[PDB]
Design a protein around this ligand. Structure first.
Ligand SMILES: Cc1nc(Nc2n[nH]c3c2CN(C(=O)N[C@H](CN(C)C)c2ccccc2)C3(C)C)c2sccc2n1
Length: 287
């Protein structure tokens, strides 16, 4: 029942009503589970982003635990910070850092990144993934929308709602979870899978950074999923434009066999990442 689920969720959040510890609430966007408001912490004056999501209105309410548990448990230089979380009425509120550089999706819809910029983004995402994968966390929703930027070009992985924490008793999942165009073939097939699915989704995000959109984006989501499931691996449209070293980097991610697919640790050691830039190199994309 709703109250039973609410009581369980309550075990993982900070205690109390946060409404009087915040002011200046302004709605700044919406997302799949709810809204995001900017607000100000009275005690400190710190501006925070607050995700607000109704426990009754979700597709799969159990995934609300991920909104809190993952950032509670896991911290990293390239992972968004959570400050506090609360239950307010029938809503879960999660207080997060406000990243003012926006999402990578809003850059790639405008311009193509150069290779130094692609390597900078990939190195940051791979450091977060190597760390999360080592802890048994599968993200399951890697795509440019999940990548947020600070004003000085620091890259942070966000959107942990679809996460799976695997364990010794259930070391693999088989659920159909993700965003269609970025889902690995083994996820679409409902085969047992683990961390490798995030490497395939990162390869689709590299295609977004080179081409502007993922493969099959003119198809409906189900039709794209059928093509990803059955067809040979997708290619860059702009394959002619990229270095041999970048092409090799991407080829090692978009591999159908999940065992042969590169791990995050393997990719961190790839020569493509020898020419990663400084955070500053992304700042021209945000101004
Ligand atoms: C809304 C918004 N947020 C920005 N900065 C932020 N800083 N911190 C955060 C955001 C947006 N955030 C976020 O969770 N958004 C997702 C959507 N995905 C695609 C990223 C979402 C929102 C509501 C419900 C479910 C999911 C957090 C981490 C709070 C910025 S910067 C310029 C415009 C802008 N507009």
């Amino acid at each position: 029942t709703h109250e039973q689920f609410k009581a369980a969720l309550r075990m993982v959040v900070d205690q109390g009503d946060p409404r009087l510890l915040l002011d200046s609430y302004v709605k700044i966007g919406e997302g799949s589970t709810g809204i995001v408001c900017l607000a100000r912490e009275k005690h400190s004056g710190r501006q925070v982003a607050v995700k607000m999501m109704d426990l009754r209105k979700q597709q799969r309410r159990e995934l609300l635990f991920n909104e809190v548990v993952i950032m509670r448990d896991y911290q990293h230089f390239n992972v968004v910070e959570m400050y506090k979380s609360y239950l307010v009425g029938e809503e879960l509120w999660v207080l997060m850092e406000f990243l003012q550089g926006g999402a990578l999706t809003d850059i790639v819809s405008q311009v193509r990144l150069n290779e130094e910029q692609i390597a900078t983004v990939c190195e940051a995402v791979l450091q977060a993934l190597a760390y999360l994968h080592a802890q048994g966390v599968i993200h399951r929703d890697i795509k440019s929308d999940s990548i947020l930027l600070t004003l000085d070009g620091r890259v942070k992985l966000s959107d942990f709602g679809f996460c799976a924490q695997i364990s010794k008793d259930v070391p693999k999942r088989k659920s159909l979870v993700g965003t269609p165009y970025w889902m690995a073939p083994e996820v679409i097939s409902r085969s047992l899978y683990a961390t490798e699915v995030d490497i395939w989704s990162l390869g689709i995000m590299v295609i977004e950074m080179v081409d502007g959109e993922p493969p099959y984006f003119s198809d409906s989501p189900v039709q794209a999923m059928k093509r990803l499931r059955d067809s040979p691996p997708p290619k860059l449209k702009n394959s002619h434009k990229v270095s041999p070293v970048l092409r090799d980097f991407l080829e090692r991610m978009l591999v159908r066999d999940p065992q042969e697919r590169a791990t995050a640790q393997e990719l961190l050691d790839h020569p493509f990442l020898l020419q990663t830039g400084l955070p500053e190199c992304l700042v021209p994309l945000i101004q």
